[PDB]
Amino acid sequence: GIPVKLLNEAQGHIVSLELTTGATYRGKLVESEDSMNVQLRDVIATEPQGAVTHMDQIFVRGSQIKFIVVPDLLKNAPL
């Protein structure tokens, strides 16, 4: 399916996302999955409060993701 391949193609670029938690994470993406797992670096979190933090490495569960936000050149990619 194409909605997963687009993700794999944004590996390397910087990504923004939203979780069921309520917070948004922003960073370079290293690995993804068909599940929608993620592996990122130099993340800059921002919760409901506005509280910023730093997280060196992160793994996720896709189930917990609401939606992603992806770079603009990834609209000319082949489907």
Partner: protein, 70 residues
């Protein structure tokens, strides 16, 4: 289905997990699952009162998994 996740690089290293109900745990990563069930040893709660325990965390619960030291 059942994509065995990429947790080989975390084995036998310290972690800072987060789970459902805003509860979080530190531990040495022993083993992992298809569904992301986890085996942690030397498990310490983060309430800020830190209680030593010695643990199998469920997959569903997991929100994320971090690394303390690079």
């Amino acid at each position: 289905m059942v994509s065995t996740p990429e947790l080989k690089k975390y084995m036998d290293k310290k972690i800072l997990l987060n789970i459902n109900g805003s509860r979080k745990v530190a531990g040495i990563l022993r083993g992992y699952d298809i569904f992301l069930n986890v085996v942690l040893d030397d498990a310490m709660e983060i309430n800020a009162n830190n209680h030593q325990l010695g643990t199998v965390i469920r997959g569903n619960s997991i929100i994320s998994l971090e690394a303390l030291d690079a």
